[PDB]
Paper text:
While chemical methylation of an amide bond uses a strong base to generate the imidate, [name], the precursor protein of the fungal peptide macrocycle omphalotin A, self-hypermethylates amides at pH 7 using S-adenosyl methionine (SAM) as cofactor. Here, we report the structure of the peptide amide methyltransferase [name] including complexes with cofactor [SAM and S-adenosyl homocysteine (SAH)], cofactor analog, substrate, and product.
Inspection of the experimental maps reveals that while the positions of substrate backbone atoms are unambiguous, density for the side chains is suggestive of some heterogeneity in the register of the bound substrate peptide. The location of the cofactor relative to the protein is identical in both the [name]ΔC18 and [name]ΔC6 complexes. The peptide carbonyl at i−3 hydrogen-bonds to the side chain of Tyr63, at i−2 to the side chain of Tyr98, and at i−1 to both Tyr66 and Tyr76. The side chains at i−1 and i−3 both sit in large hydrophobic pockets, while the side chains at i−4, i−5, and i−6 are exposed to solvent. The substrate side chains do not make any specific contacts with [name], consistent with the protein’s ability to methylate different residues (Gly, Val, Ile, Met, Thr, and Ala).
Author numbering:
A (entry chain A): 8 to 381, 403 to 411
B (entry chain B): 8 to 265, 277 to 381, 406 to 411
Amino acid sequence: KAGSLTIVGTGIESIGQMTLQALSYIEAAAKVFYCVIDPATEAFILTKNKNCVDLYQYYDNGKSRLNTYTQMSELMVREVRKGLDVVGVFYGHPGVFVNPSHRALAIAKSEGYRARMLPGVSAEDCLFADLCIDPSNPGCLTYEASDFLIRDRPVSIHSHLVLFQVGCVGIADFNFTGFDNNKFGVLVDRLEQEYGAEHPVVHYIAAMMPHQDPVTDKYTVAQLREPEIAKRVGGVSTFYIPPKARKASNLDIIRRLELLPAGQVPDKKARIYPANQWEPDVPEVEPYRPSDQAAIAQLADHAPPEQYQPLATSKAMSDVMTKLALDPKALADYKADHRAFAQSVPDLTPQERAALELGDSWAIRCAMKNMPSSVVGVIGVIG
Amino acid sequence: KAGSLTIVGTGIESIGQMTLQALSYIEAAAKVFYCVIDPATEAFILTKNKNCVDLYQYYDNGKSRLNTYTQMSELMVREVRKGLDVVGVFYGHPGVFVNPSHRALAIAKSEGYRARMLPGVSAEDCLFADLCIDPSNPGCLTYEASDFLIRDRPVSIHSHLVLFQVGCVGIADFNFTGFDNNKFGVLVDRLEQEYGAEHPVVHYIAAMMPHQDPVTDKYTVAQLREPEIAKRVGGVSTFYIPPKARKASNLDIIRRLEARIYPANQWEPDVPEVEPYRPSDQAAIAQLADHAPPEQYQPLATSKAMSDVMTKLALDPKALADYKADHRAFAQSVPDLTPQERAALELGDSWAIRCAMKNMPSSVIGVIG
Ligand SMILES: Nc1ncnc2c1ncn2[C@@H]1O[C@H](CSCC[C@H](N)C(=O)O)[C@@H](O)[C@H]1O
Ligand SMILES: Nc1ncnc2c1ncn2[C@@H]1O[C@H](CSCC[C@H](N)C(=O)O)[C@@H](O)[C@H]1O
């Protein structure tokens, strides 16, 4: 069947946080539907495709968001049924707290059209970067604020907590001026029950324009009841709640994992630098210790290991691999006939020519780097 | 004070998943430090800046990663101390399950230099897109697999669970050939204990090359004890465990405040099919017949010169620096803006620039969730 739907994101900050593939698919699209919240990004989109319709006009005062979301999705699928290659655009990540994207893709799939979502940079990604925290340490809980209340979602006082849509608690509608967030007190009551009146809450707004600074204002739970503070929390506000304390290691698991043998007890409180700047009364960890200093001393005599594989490729091969990532029409051709496409690319080496015809990951990477005398695998664990 | 450190990401799929701002900062850098795991992306970066060093060479067989990570961070901050503007590059999101970026920035921050991280597209972002799930519904738990076991982190059977680094449970070092993931069974035991033997677990590997398909294989917890299946789990493997059931509403809270949504989670066990066009949907679709923009709706109405300059600030890191360094001189230096546009750039306030670019009727909200 002719016709496809691809949904892409623009990221949070104006223009700069759009990915290269999102841009290339927008330019190649036959018609574009977008929902963005900054004018420079909107104007930028209109420079890349002449046949765009702004989905934001389907919100309205006192109109259920469900009705808006249903309308948005059908407009996209209508152009798919006419056999056209359609691109939908939502700011941030288009599948993160976005109802209409999943709806439209699922309909297109069930009806038999090609359908794919390309990921983007979400508001939580911005949060990790600007607050300088990692979801790995000590885990991350992510909830919708109203759902968090209505279905009593468990807190974990030892992990990160991220809450979206704190500016429209219990509110199912839209209003152009703003929300009367008069049920905000119900969230605050729950956070006090779970965390205590003096536990920190960080009010986070990622910068939308390139020259702006983010807001990273630290409050207590109790401070959130004061009227002048509550009204600063709006439609682009997210909360970050840091852990209350550190969870103890399970002795039986350390033994089963063989990190310690039969009779040994782990070094409690061994903390990895750096410490969470937001956790209350978290102590200072020293960036340089004897163990750190000895690792640094080896930097003097360090040379590349034997089995380290430096990149060794060609202009033709780099160019074609770049082209596949940035040229959707070239990618479709290669996927149509791996061999035929590879035969038309000039100046590849024989090993390059065989790797491209196969297209397998193992063959091409061996083709593009130098092999130390010893099939080659993939390991990127920096966490 | 002179010297800065900017850390950026490349996303997961080669090249295409890099952000525009990541590219411009790489090109502008005095020195570039990169850590990527695909060859096309490495080659692409090396064309865009001519002073790069590959950090990957500080791993080694049998070497603790903590030693490598301290080395990676020290290499960068030493050049910052010389007063240089340096950018570090890590694949995916440069702050998601990556240790040395925070360390290097924290050292730089302690010594008084400007230090910033630019976000990228993580493997979890790819998971949501390829598995067609939304973190909003019904919430999402994300853990490091070894931490999950050692600290006995709580599960929630009604929310999404995502586990990173399942291919090296309990392994603190590195090897070029591969991990012998022989403690994987302790993790499988925990999953059986929490969800039961027949609950689904989807093994996910996002495509790294643009022509590749993702791995999206659905297995029961019990099949993960077969040898031939366990060896499939490697250094780029992530697990998604879907919810077992739907949690009841709090009857107290619903009234204190003033049936499933299509579509259903395809991966949940024993969850019924939903109708996409219920009658309430069809009435909203009926509203298609005659619709116009609302009265307070603000259509975009800007100029080429204005759109161009705001774009330049997003795509030219030095121009941004010049603007931030001196609002007054830059705004007046730009030709062809109207009187309210140049004044709006001199101000820099969010409200002013927006008024200059949008038609306001006679008189920031983006909730699609
Ligand atoms: N600039 C910003 N800074 C912090 N949070 C933001 C934000 N913009 C939107 N959000 C959050 O996202 C919610 C809207 S739902 C849209 C989210 C978007 N798809 C994304 O990828 O992030 C808001 O209620 C708010 O909680
Ligand atoms: N292609 C892929 N598909 C699924 N998970 C992946 C992946 N590549 C890396 N990962 C996950 O990331 C871990 C490495 S730690 C690096 C994570 C990276 N910074 C990011 O933003 O995603 C791996 O153990 C694996 O769980």
